[PDB]
Amino acid sequence: NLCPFGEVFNATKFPSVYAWERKKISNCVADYSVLYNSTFFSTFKCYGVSATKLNDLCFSNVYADSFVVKGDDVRQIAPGQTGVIADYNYKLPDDFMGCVLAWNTRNIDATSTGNYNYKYRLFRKSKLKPFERDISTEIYQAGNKPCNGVAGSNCYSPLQSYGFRPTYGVGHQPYRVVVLSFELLNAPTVCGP
Amino acid sequence: STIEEQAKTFLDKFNHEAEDLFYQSSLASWNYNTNITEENVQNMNNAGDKWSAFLKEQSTLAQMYPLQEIQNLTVKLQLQALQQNGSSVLSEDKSKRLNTILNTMSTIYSTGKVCNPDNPQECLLLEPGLNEIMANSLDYNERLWAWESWRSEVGKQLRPLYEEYVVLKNEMARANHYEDYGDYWRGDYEVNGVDGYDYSRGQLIEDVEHTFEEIKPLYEHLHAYVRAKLMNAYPSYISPIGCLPAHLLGDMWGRFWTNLYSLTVPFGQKPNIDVTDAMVDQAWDAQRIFKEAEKFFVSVGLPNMTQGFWENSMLTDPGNVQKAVCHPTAWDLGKGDFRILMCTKVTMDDFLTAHHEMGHIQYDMAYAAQPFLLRNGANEGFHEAVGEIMSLSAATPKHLKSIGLLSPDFQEDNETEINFLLKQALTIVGTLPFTYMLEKWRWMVFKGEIPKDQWMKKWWEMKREIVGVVEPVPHDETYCDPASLFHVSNDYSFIRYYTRTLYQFQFQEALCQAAKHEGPLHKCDISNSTEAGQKLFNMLRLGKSEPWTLALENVVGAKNMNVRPLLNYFEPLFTWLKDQNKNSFVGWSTDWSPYA
Ligand SMILES: *[C@@H]1O[C@H](CO)[C@@H](O[C@@H]2O[C@H](CO)[C@@H](O[C@@H]3O[C@H](CO)[C@@H](O)[C@H](O)[C@@H]3O)[C@H](O)[C@H]2NC(C)=O)[C@H](O)[C@H]1NC(C)=O
Ligand SMILES: *[C@@H]1O[C@H](CO)[C@@H](O[C@@H]2O[C@H](CO)[C@@H](O[C@@H]3O[C@H](CO)[C@@H](O)[C@H](O)[C@@H]3O)[C@H](O)[C@H]2NC(C)=O)[C@H](O)[C@H]1NC(C)=O
Ligand SMILES: *[C@@H]1O[C@H](CO)[C@@H](O[C@@H]2O[C@H](CO)[C@@H](O)[C@H](O)[C@H]2NC(C)=O)[C@H](O)[C@H]1NC(C)=O
Ligand SMILES: *[C@@H]1O[C@H](CO)[C@@H](O[C@@H]2O[C@H](CO)[C@@H](O)[C@H](O)[C@H]2NC(C)=O)[C@H](O)[C@H]1NC(C)=O
Ligand SMILES: *[C@@H]1O[C@H](CO)[C@@H](O[C@@H]2O[C@H](CO)[C@@H](O)[C@H](O)[C@H]2NC(C)=O)[C@H](O)[C@H]1NC(C)=O
Ligand SMILES: *[C@@H]1O[C@H](CO)[C@@H](O)[C@H](O)[C@H]1NC(C)=O
Ligand SMILES: [Cl-]
Ligand SMILES: [Zn+2]
């Protein structure tokens, strides 16, 4: 039985980077001739292991995380970054073993009036631990003011939304990003003969 | 959280909230300037009003953080610009009245038509009617009509509106802690806080004059040379010792003396380096002109033009199907969108104009990494200095033959170099006393030094004294000839064109110096010099973050503007000009008038 990689990549809608999603993959054969035999990607940079001998490798379970980020911020899906996304939306561990994938989606994630669905967190007290996730919409306190559940002076709503217009530059263009994390354990799944 | 930390997170929220509104407001202004429809002109003002309403709201929210508490130099500058009370410091009705008179001055200037007394059925406006006369006509009476009609018709309508424009704008400046409106404009050059790099609003008046005092000798010789030539084209109309009549100066206002080249050409027997015939006869199109432009910047170490620039820029006249504005512009919509709007014609002038506006884009593409409030030139005169450096390097005959528009067998005599420098002098140095005298008068009017009973009387005292130009017909206070120029009637500061002329030659000399250029400075092509490119790039990326004096040092190595690069550029012409005035009078008597 095959691993459903297409279910995380070829999916219809993708989540916002602040509220990204994960998908755990267990016992199944893994055909990676779909990814390396493809010039369709705009990044494809691996960490911890090569891009080809992953066919003959086995892990306890593989974690596929996916979201959408502007073209410029794809720079931050790498171990040890300190941008807005890496700190408040999706942080990777320094001991990350896996690959990062990304492909331009201006045709389907950018509209004439601007696709404001895709959002990112701009304000958050303390960074994110690796693989942490925060869907909080609490009114962020920037000054010494109580916010009383209201936003305004020294109280800023933390989430900001991309305004994906199809005429933006490559940097400010939507890029669907899927990150494949590899879990190792002394317990007894994802090989590929 | 400290006062500085709250202001920083406020700037963080502001930048990401201003980026999206500026793009929507700039796209709507692009939808009108490329497609004149009533649906897009309302789409323009709604996005433009939302942008201004967002600003005046955020202007007060920036005042929430007192500037005196900030020690971070970047956040301090940004908060300063946002807190500019500006027009909001006026009362409701006075501000609304001010906006009304600013549009009417723009309206009667853009819609003012003069009618021919000979043929009253033919009535012309400035473009193309009056400008074509003042540029091409040789009839003294015809040029006198076109010059005077625009000042006695449009300029007279502008006179009461400009009197009220001064007092209302003075109410804005003083309420914003300024001496006058001329002090407000001089604040663009102000640097306040950085040790060793400070520069005051009074410093501008001092330095521009100190450099202008050293500019007089070259201009005095160019004046005497042009004057003697004009005596031949208008015999018994010009005194060999008096000033030049204002209507014989090439255009409607005498801003540039380019059109006098057909009269003042030193060696007319020489073939001109104008390759306009080569561009038309080679079936070049607007694409070839701008793709050749991009090739220039890349071969110096600068990035390409974005694909959004390629598909979305308007590079041709939109035809009979689409009515649009055709003023050559370079658009920086933000969010990594850069475009150029230009109804390009296949002529040499557009090949150099394509390099000017594309220089703006390269400047825009560089400082896009700065925060939103600092994505701008170091001062108002920095961007146009960049656009003209491309026009300078691309105009050299060596660059023309390296592109394929000039034949390899073009021999560069000391005559064809004097023809070119005289060609460059009529448009560059000729506008410097004009630009200075104009802003000098505006600074004094805003200062209240020229009472309304002698506005025009003092205006022409400086015209004859500073620039060396006399009115052909006597003008009283009913006229408003200053407001007969676009920048004066449309609230544009004008000293930036003087300062850009001094900035541009400091840049070009230092960049050609970095390119190991050896011959005359005017003979320098910067192409293939990746070394000089990164030198200039060190300044383009700074934007408005660094003080303009500091950013100027990173390219030229100087703290203040300098005239010597301008003097050295025109050194072959200045010595030859000294010769051509050996039996001619340099200087002018301010008292001679072409009337009684
Ligand atoms: C998302 O959907 C696309 C298209 O439905 C999938 O790409 C397809 O992948 C298959 C298998 O890799 C390709 O089939 C053929 O495989 C044989 C194996 O021997 C190979 O020799 C052929 O050259 C060919 O690659 C198919 O051509 C390919 N189609 C396209 C349009 O790329 C993709 O696998 C899906 N996403 C994921 C993550 O699986
Ligand atoms: C005023 O405050 C700003 C806050 O934005 C200061 O600028 C920021 O300074 C930090 C500290 O060096 C920079 O962080 C660095 O980011 C790079 C990104 O690649 C990262 O690799 C480094 O490890 C480090 O974390 C940050 O980039 C910088 N941001 C900007 C826009 O300049 C600034 O220094 C303060 N100035 C003064 C005079 O206090
Ligand atoms: C010029 O502007 C108009 C609107 O000001 C653009 O929109 C056209 O007109 C109506 C507006 O709702 C639409 O139904 C049409 O389909 C639009 N297109 C055309 C071709 O009429 C118009 O697109 C603009 N033209 C260009 C070339 O950008
Ligand atoms: C700048 O853009 C030009 C595009 O004209 C690049 O030229 C490339 O060269 C080959 C030969 O024509 C083309 O097949 C490529 O597709 C061109 N690239 C592009 C993006 O069109 C040139 O390489 C670019 N250089 C830099 C430094 O950006
Ligand atoms: C910079 O050096 C390059 C080196 O090739 C020159 O490029 C060639 O020169 C002529 C015109 O001078 C063109 O017709 C050729 O097609 C160019 N080659 C290519 C591959 O495009 C270039 O001219 C030099 N530029 C200068 C000296 O300004
Ligand atoms: C702007 O004007 C208000 C009053 O209208 C004043 O309190 C405030 O200090 C001014 N701010 C600046 C920066 O001039
Ligand atoms: Cl005048
Ligand atoms: Zn320009």
Coordinates of N, CA and C in Angstrom, one line a residue, chain B residues 388-479:
Chain B
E388 N 19.5 60.8 -14.7 CA 20.3 61.5 -15.7 C 21.7 61.0 -15.9
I389 N 22.2 60.2 -14.9 CA 23.5 59.5 -15.0 C 23.4 58.5 -16.1
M390 N 22.3 57.8 -16.3 CA 22.1 56.9 -17.4 C 22.0 57.7 -18.7
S391 N 21.3 58.8 -18.7 CA 21.3 59.6 -19.9 C 22.7 60.1 -20.3
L392 N 23.5 60.4 -19.3 CA 24.9 60.9 -19.6 C 25.7 59.8 -20.2
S393 N 25.8 58.6 -19.6 CA 26.6 57.5 -20.1 C 26.1 57.0 -21.4
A394 N 24.8 56.9 -21.6 CA 24.2 56.4 -22.8 C 24.3 57.4 -24.0
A395 N 24.7 58.6 -23.8 CA 24.8 59.6 -24.8 C 26.2 59.7 -25.5
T396 N 27.2 59.0 -24.9 CA 28.5 59.0 -25.4 C 28.5 58.3 -26.8
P397 N 29.2 58.8 -27.8 CA 29.3 58.2 -29.1 C 29.9 56.8 -29.0
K398 N 30.8 56.5 -28.1 CA 31.3 55.1 -27.9 C 30.2 54.2 -27.4
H399 N 29.3 54.7 -26.6 CA 28.1 53.8 -26.2 C 27.1 53.7 -27.3
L400 N 27.0 54.7 -28.2 CA 26.1 54.6 -29.3 C 26.5 53.5 -30.3
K401 N 27.9 53.4 -30.6 CA 28.4 52.4 -31.5 C 28.4 51.0 -30.9
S402 N 28.6 51.0 -29.5 CA 28.5 49.7 -28.8 C 27.1 49.1 -28.8
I403 N 26.1 49.8 -29.2 CA 24.7 49.3 -29.2 C 24.3 49.1 -30.6
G404 N 24.9 49.8 -31.6 CA 24.6 49.6 -33.0 C 23.9 50.7 -33.7
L405 N 23.7 51.8 -33.0 CA 23.0 53.0 -33.6 C 23.9 54.0 -34.2
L406 N 25.2 54.0 -33.9 CA 26.2 54.9 -34.5 C 27.2 54.1 -35.2
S407 N 27.6 54.6 -36.4 CA 28.5 53.9 -37.3 C 29.9 53.9 -36.6
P408 N 30.7 52.9 -36.8 CA 32.1 52.9 -36.2 C 33.0 54.0 -36.8
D409 N 32.7 54.5 -38.0 CA 33.5 55.6 -38.6 C 33.0 57.0 -38.3
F410 N 32.6 57.2 -37.0 CA 32.2 58.5 -36.6 C 33.5 59.1 -35.9
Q411 N 34.0 60.1 -36.5 CA 35.3 60.7 -36.0 C 34.9 61.8 -34.9
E412 N 35.5 61.7 -33.8 CA 35.2 62.5 -32.6 C 36.3 63.7 -32.6
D413 N 36.0 64.7 -33.3 CA 36.8 65.9 -33.4 C 36.7 66.7 -32.1
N414 N 37.5 67.7 -31.9 CA 37.3 68.7 -30.9 C 36.1 69.6 -31.2
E415 N 35.6 69.5 -32.5 CA 34.4 70.3 -32.8 C 33.2 69.5 -32.4
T416 N 33.1 68.2 -32.7 CA 31.9 67.4 -32.3 C 31.8 67.3 -30.8
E417 N 32.9 67.4 -30.1 CA 32.9 67.4 -28.6 C 32.4 68.8 -28.1
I418 N 32.8 69.9 -28.8 CA 32.3 71.2 -28.5 C 30.8 71.4 -28.8
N419 N 30.4 70.8 -30.0 CA 29.0 70.8 -30.3 C 28.2 70.1 -29.3
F420 N 28.7 69.0 -28.7 CA 27.9 68.2 -27.7 C 27.9 69.0 -26.4
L421 N 29.0 69.5 -26.0 CA 29.0 70.3 -24.7 C 28.2 71.5 -24.8
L422 N 28.3 72.2 -25.9 CA 27.4 73.4 -26.1 C 25.9 72.9 -26.1
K423 N 25.7 71.7 -26.7 CA 24.4 71.1 -26.7 C 23.9 70.8 -25.3
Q424 N 24.8 70.3 -24.5 CA 24.5 70.0 -23.1 C 24.5 71.2 -22.2
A425 N 25.2 72.3 -22.6 CA 25.2 73.5 -21.8 C 23.9 74.3 -21.9
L426 N 23.3 74.3 -23.1 CA 22.1 75.1 -23.2 C 21.0 74.6 -22.3
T427 N 21.0 73.3 -22.0 CA 19.9 72.7 -21.2 C 20.3 72.5 -19.8
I428 N 21.6 72.4 -19.4 CA 22.0 72.1 -18.1 C 22.3 73.4 -17.3
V429 N 23.3 74.1 -17.7 CA 23.7 75.3 -17.0 C 22.7 76.5 -17.2
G430 N 22.1 76.5 -18.4 CA 21.1 77.6 -18.7 C 20.0 77.6 -17.7
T431 N 19.6 76.4 -17.2 CA 18.5 76.3 -16.2 C 18.9 76.6 -14.8
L432 N 20.2 76.7 -14.5 CA 20.6 76.9 -13.1 C 20.3 78.2 -12.5
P433 N 20.7 79.4 -13.2 CA 20.2 80.7 -12.7 C 18.7 80.8 -12.7
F434 N 18.0 80.2 -13.7 CA 16.6 80.1 -13.7 C 16.0 79.5 -12.5
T435 N 16.5 78.2 -12.2 CA 16.0 77.5 -11.1 C 16.3 78.2 -9.8
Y436 N 17.5 78.7 -9.6 CA 17.8 79.5 -8.4 C 17.0 80.7 -8.2
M437 N 16.9 81.6 -9.2 CA 16.2 82.8 -9.2 C 14.7 82.5 -8.9
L438 N 14.1 81.5 -9.4 CA 12.8 81.1 -9.2 C 12.5 80.8 -7.7
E439 N 13.3 79.8 -7.2 CA 13.1 79.4 -5.8 C 13.5 80.6 -4.9
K440 N 14.5 81.4 -5.3 CA 14.9 82.5 -4.5 C 13.7 83.5 -4.3
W441 N 13.0 83.7 -5.4 CA 11.8 84.6 -5.3 C 10.7 83.9 -4.4
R442 N 10.5 82.6 -4.6 CA 9.4 81.9 -3.8 C 9.8 81.9 -2.4
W443 N 11.1 81.7 -2.0 CA 11.5 81.8 -0.6 C 11.2 83.1 0.0
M444 N 11.5 84.2 -0.8 CA 11.3 85.5 -0.3 C 9.8 85.9 -0.2
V445 N 9.0 85.4 -1.1 CA 7.5 85.6 -1.1 C 6.9 85.0 0.1
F446 N 7.3 83.7 0.3 CA 6.8 83.0 1.5 C 7.4 83.6 2.8
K447 N 8.6 84.2 2.7 CA 9.1 84.9 3.9 C 8.5 86.3 4.1
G448 N 7.6 86.7 3.2 CA 7.0 88.0 3.3 C 7.8 89.2 2.9
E449 N 9.0 89.0 2.3 CA 9.9 90.0 1.9 C 9.4 90.8 0.7
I450 N 8.6 90.2 -0.2 CA 8.1 90.9 -1.3 C 6.6 91.2 -1.2
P451 N 6.2 92.4 -0.8 CA 4.8 92.7 -0.6 C 4.0 92.5 -1.9
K452 N 2.7 92.3 -1.8 CA 1.9 92.0 -3.0 C 1.8 93.1 -4.0
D453 N 2.2 94.4 -3.6 CA 2.2 95.5 -4.5 C 3.4 95.5 -5.4
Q454 N 4.4 94.7 -5.1 CA 5.6 94.6 -6.0 C 6.1 93.2 -6.2
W455 N 5.1 92.2 -6.3 CA 5.5 90.9 -6.6 C 6.2 90.8 -7.9
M456 N 5.5 91.2 -9.0 CA 6.0 91.2 -10.3 C 7.2 92.1 -10.6
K457 N 7.1 93.3 -9.8 CA 8.2 94.2 -10.0 C 9.5 93.7 -9.4
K458 N 9.5 93.0 -8.3 CA 10.7 92.4 -7.8 C 11.1 91.1 -8.5
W459 N 10.1 90.4 -9.1 CA 10.4 89.2 -9.8 C 11.3 89.5 -11.0
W460 N 11.0 90.5 -11.7 CA 11.9 90.9 -12.9 C 13.1 91.6 -12.5
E461 N 13.2 92.2 -11.3 CA 14.5 92.7 -10.9 C 15.5 91.6 -10.7
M462 N 15.1 90.5 -10.2 CA 16.0 89.3 -10.1 C 16.2 88.6 -11.4
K463 N 15.2 88.7 -12.3 CA 15.3 88.1 -13.6 C 16.5 88.7 -14.4
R464 N 16.5 90.0 -14.4 CA 17.6 90.7 -15.1 C 18.9 90.6 -14.4
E465 N 18.9 90.5 -13.1 CA 20.1 90.6 -12.3 C 20.7 89.2 -12.2
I466 N 20.0 88.1 -11.9 CA 20.5 86.8 -11.6 C 20.7 86.0 -12.8
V467 N 19.6 85.8 -13.6 CA 19.6 84.9 -14.7 C 20.0 85.7 -16.0
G468 N 19.8 87.0 -16.0 CA 20.2 87.8 -17.2 C 19.1 87.8 -18.3
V469 N 17.9 87.9 -17.9 CA 16.7 87.9 -18.8 C 15.9 89.1 -18.6
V470 N 15.4 89.7 -19.6 CA 14.6 90.9 -19.5 C 13.2 90.6 -20.2
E471 N 12.2 91.2 -19.6 CA 10.8 91.0 -20.1 C 10.7 91.8 -21.5
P472 N 10.0 91.2 -22.4 CA 9.8 91.9 -23.7 C 8.7 93.0 -23.7
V473 N 7.8 92.8 -22.8 CA 6.7 93.8 -22.6 C 6.5 94.1 -21.1
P474 N 6.3 95.3 -20.6 CA 6.2 95.6 -19.2 C 5.0 94.9 -18.5
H475 N 5.3 94.3 -17.4 CA 4.3 93.6 -16.6 C 4.1 94.3 -15.2
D476 N 2.9 94.5 -14.9 CA 2.5 95.0 -13.6 C 2.1 93.9 -12.7
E477 N 1.5 94.2 -11.5 CA 1.1 93.2 -10.5 C -0.1 92.5 -10.9
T478 N -0.8 92.8 -12.0 CA -1.9 92.0 -12.4 C -1.5 90.6 -12.9
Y479 N -0.3 90.5 -13.5 CA 0.3 89.3 -13.9 C 0.7 88.5 -12.7

